[PDB]
Design a protein around this nucleic acid. Structure first.
Lengths: 206, 100, 127, 98, 150
RNA sequence: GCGAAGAACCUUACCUGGUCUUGACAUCCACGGAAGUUUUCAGAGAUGAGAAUGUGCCUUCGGGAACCGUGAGACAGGUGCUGCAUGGCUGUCGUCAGCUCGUGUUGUGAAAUGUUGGGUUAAGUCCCGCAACGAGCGCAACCCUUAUCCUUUGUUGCCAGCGGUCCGGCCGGGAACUCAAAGGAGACUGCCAGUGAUAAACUGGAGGAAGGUGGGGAUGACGUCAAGUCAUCAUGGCCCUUACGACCAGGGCUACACACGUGCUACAAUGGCGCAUACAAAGAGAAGCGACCUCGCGAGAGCAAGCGGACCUCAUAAAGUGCGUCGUAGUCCGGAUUGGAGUCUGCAACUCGACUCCAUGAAGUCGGAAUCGCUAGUAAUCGUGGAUCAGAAUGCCACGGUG
RNA sequence: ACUAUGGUUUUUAUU
């Protein structure tokens, strides 16, 4: 029964929307179409740059896209000024002039999306990923976790055989809405399957 | 479903722009013999009767990620079967959750 | 001595005010003769209060809005009894023998998913 | 001579924008009428709960659209000249009428 | 099972009077119009008082004295044995059960006017002249033997 | 009324006849043209041939990009086959009290123990005592809603007190009330009396607007059927290639011997008819919602203000009330297949769609065995809006009265 | 007191 989204229940609690702007309902559908297009235009233009999250701000005659990265240096790029390709990519598609805005990720080895990406980069090569899962769990309890969990499941061959693998420490309270728990999925998209990974990190209640 | 719709859209949006979307108020004067002494309507009637394919009929817009005949949210433009990962994650402005 | 109270029931909202004077009743700023009801006048404001006497040596003012007109009478009865239950230490419990000082909390219970209207449980019937 | 409108989808964000309007238009000339809250156009936004073979349950979202008029009485176009230049953060729509 | 909410205690009325008269104007309510029974309550009695009883004060007392259920019948089993069993009815609502058996028949019979469909029913109830009561009694009479068990 | 928010065409799987072959659509590697507009014939159309017409962007002027078209091979493509195949998504046991593991203990071992046994509960809930002692998921709580008291600002919402006033918040003014939204406060088995290894834990009472997981939601513990779904979205392997692919036109889905599922309106007379007469509430809305007013028996169609919506409009509350009248009748009530003329969208409603006006008229006397659903604002009952949409639903999703 | 019959084969990890 149920289980329609692991974050859809918790993500309104003290959390502003991932896009902020106002439009009248008779103007809204094209204003939202352009809001998905600015994500898609970013993901075809920026790769491997340690980005965890992006947030959309569309104030009057303006667009701002907050980019959260573990490596500000590889987003701000060459000489600290290779930002214009990354700034202008959203401007003509959004229909408004664009600014640049970068943010640095707090404890990147304690962030479930970037830990998942470290494992995805080794699942897309089918080697060292099991070591990376083990080490992510060992280190998270020394970085600030009160518990951590990973899972890889189903096929990974070669052979037809199905295998699950985790490594796990402490607690992962999903249903406690004060748990402040982090969750992300990631996929490797290989000639041997979709090859997904699931990551949960718990730092503590409130 | 198949990805067949753009090969029709590319001819049918122009068919609508030329023979439908700017031809609706024309109907209120094109056949009126008292509202014109100038010969101006007979020729554009012969042009307007040329197309025979779609416009108001035989043609529905359909969703963009899949050309499904239904599930298009009119005042949002998205398919109700390809929106949950955005809707749940707070990516549509003004929608709130949970329990009310 | 002067008395006041408010009361609600199923879209009806009422207020009642009471003064010393001659037995006169005002409802929606007009005298009680300018009102219409399908039952006999001045009952719902008098009968619950004959334990202290009513409407013979008191000057009344009543206002009511919304809901059904016999539901409005219920809201007025709740208002006038709640306005005067402080008149004695036992009157608060003598009015509970009738139950008019308890609030009629009826106001559309919220819908359950996937069920049609309020809480009514699902029905699959045959087989 | 003129009047304004402010729209948002959140009660705390429309307050966070009202805090800028009173600071941008209602101090010179000093204008003293306080902000009425107005209706929020409460509605449920609904879609089928699952993408396949279920049509019986729907997913429930809360929609509100807040309105503030804030009230201005000074007739000069100078009353809005800074409000048509200053923030006003992202997430709200302002409108100048008459 | 055992819970179940506590069964209700009903009410009297400030005009209709007793708990049973307050039930008469509220039982068999259909279409919810709630103004039909207040012209039919204690309004079939003046002709009853000259057809199957006396006075408008005893015309309905005698109806619920002639219609008087004292026993109910129901199946009971204990393993591989089944019996139709008789049980004495509790007195406190006994006259309200009898009332129901009259006011429903005025709905389930459709002959002439509603100004007749109840008055014509009451004039046989005040005499214990109900439909098919000989075969009704034939069940309770047959079940009497099962108060001796197996 | 499942896959699928509307079956004329279109949808749609199916059938037929046309037609295309590196393919409608993609990359790879080459070679030209801007994207493309205008127009005539032929062809069911897809197209097949002609005749006019355009030269946008970046250029170091070399050629090129997006984009269009044509190739040689690898290939593209598939409502083809399969969830006893995979990623995903669901259906169901399950708001039930359950699930599982470490350390000690027992046993030759699978396994046991813990989770037992006594009290208690909604409860693997709490307490006690045992060769057991502990720990996590589910429970319970965090989230969310509601009857109540307090508080904040007053237009397009309200008006007690106070001054004026046909005596309308209207004008001076004002939050006692209402509306709007928010934030605080109230309730805790706390207090009492009993019941109970005075343990752990129930029952009842007072005071209260509210009483005992506060009431009600959000939920869904491993596993089970080794369930369904490739045709909601992806995809492997086999299989199809001048094609099972995909560009079109014409046909199929109300094709018929009857059964099976689920609903609608009646069979009334507390009803039917005639006549008079009252109150909304929530919603949607600019080639819009359309007032007042006309024209047409009428569906509708016109003229022409208000308003981009707490404002104006859709718009009219019905049930009811109350006086006359008929009188349980296969007709008096009920309305199906009719007879006639009208209203409408669109390329077009002959055949598969809806509406209206005036006559006619069949079945229908509460239903077979059997078996299905419940509990206060619930059943039944009567009004309104909106979504889907070229056009059309007693369906779907919301609002309110009588109860 | 409703209950007799029910063809074949059946799933996870190993050096």
């Amino acid at each position: 029964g149920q289980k329609v989204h692991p974050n859809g229940i918790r993500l309104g609690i003290v959390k502003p929307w991932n896009s902020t702007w106002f439009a009248n309902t008779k103007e809204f559908a094209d204003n939202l179409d352009s809001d998905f297009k600015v994500r898609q235009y970013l993901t075809k233009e920026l790769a491997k740059a340690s980005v965890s999250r992006i947030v959309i701000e569309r104030p009057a005659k303006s667009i701002r896209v907050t980019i959260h990265t573990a490596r500000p240096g590889i987003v701000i790029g060459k000489k600290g000024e290779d930002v214009e390709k990354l700034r202008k990519v959203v401007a003509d598609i959004a229909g408004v002039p664009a600014q640049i805005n970068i943010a640095e990720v707090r404890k990147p080895e304690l962030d479930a999306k970037l830990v998942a990406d470290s494992i995805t980069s080794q699942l897309e090569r089918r080697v060292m990923f099991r070591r990376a899962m083990k080490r992510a769990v060992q280190n998270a309890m020394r970085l600030g976790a009160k518990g951590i969990k990973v899972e890889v499941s189903g096929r990974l061959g070669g052979a037809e055989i199905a295998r699950t693998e985790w490594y796990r420490e402490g607690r992962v309270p999903l249903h406690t809405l004060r748990a402040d728990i982090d969750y992300n999925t990631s996929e490797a998209h290989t000639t041997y399957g979709v090859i997904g990974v699931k990551v949960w990190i718990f730092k503590g209640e409130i | 479903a198949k990805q067949s719709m753009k090969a029709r859209e590319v001819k049918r949006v122009a068919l609508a722009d030329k023979y439908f979307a700017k031809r609706a108020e024309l109907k209120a004067i094109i056949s009126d013999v008292n509202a014109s002494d100038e010969d101006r309507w007979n020729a554009v009637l012969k042009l307007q009767t040329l197309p025979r394919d779609s416009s108001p009929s035989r043609q529905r817009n359909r969703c963009r990620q899949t050309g499904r005949p239904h599930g298009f949210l009119r005042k949002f433009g998205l398919s109700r079967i390809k929106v949950r990962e955005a809707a749940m994650r707070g990516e549509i402005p003004g929608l709130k959750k949970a329990s009310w | 001595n002067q008395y006041y109270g408010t009361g609600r029931r199923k879209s009806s909202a009422a207020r009642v005010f009471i003064k010393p004077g001659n037995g006169k009743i005002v409802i929606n700023q007009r005298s009680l003769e300018q009102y219409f009801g399908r039952e006999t006048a001045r009952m719902v404001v008098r009968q619950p209060l004959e334990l202290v006497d009513m409407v013979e040596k008191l000057d009344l003012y009543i206002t009511v809005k919304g809901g059904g007109i016999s539901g409005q009478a219920g809201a007025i009865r709740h208002g006038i009894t709640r306005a005067l239950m402080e008149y004695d230490e036992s009157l608060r419990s003598e009015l509970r023998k009738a139950g008019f000082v308890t609030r009629d909390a009826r106001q559309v219970e919220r819908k359950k998913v996937g069920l049609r209207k309020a809480r009514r449980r699902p029905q699959f019937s045959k087989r | 001579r003129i009047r304004i409108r402010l729209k948002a989808f959140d009660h705390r964000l429309i307050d966070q924008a009202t805090a800028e309007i009173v600071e941008t238009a209602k101090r010179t000339g000093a204008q003293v009428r306080g902000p009425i809250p107005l209706p929020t156009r409460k509605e449920r936004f609904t879609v089928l709960i699952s993408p396949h073979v279920n049509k019986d349950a729907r997913d429930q979202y809360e929609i509100r659209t807040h309105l503030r008029l804030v009230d201005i009485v000074e007739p000069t176009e100078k009353t809005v000249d800074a409000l048509m230049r200053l923030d006003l953060a992202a997430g709200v729509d302002v409108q100048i009428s008459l | 099972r055992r819970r179940v909410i506590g069964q209700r205690k009903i009410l009297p009325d400030p005009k209709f009077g007793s708990e049973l008269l307050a039930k008469f104007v509220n039982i068999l309510m259909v279409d919810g119009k709630k103004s039909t029974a207040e012209s039919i309550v204690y309004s079939a009695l003046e002709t009853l008082a000259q057809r199957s009883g006396k006075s408008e004060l005893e015309a309905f007392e005698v109806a619920l004295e002639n219609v008087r259920p004292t026993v109910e019948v129901k199946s009971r089993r204990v393993g591989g044995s089944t019996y139709q069993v008789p049980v004495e009815v509790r007195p406190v609502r006994r006259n309200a059960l009898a009332m129901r058996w009259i006011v429903e028949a005025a709905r389930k019979r459709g002959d002439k006017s509603m100004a007749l469909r109840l008055a014509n029913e009451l004039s046989d109830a005040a005499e214990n002249k109900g439909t098919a009561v000989k075969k009704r009694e034939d069940v309770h009479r047959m079940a009497e033997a099962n108060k001796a068990f197996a």
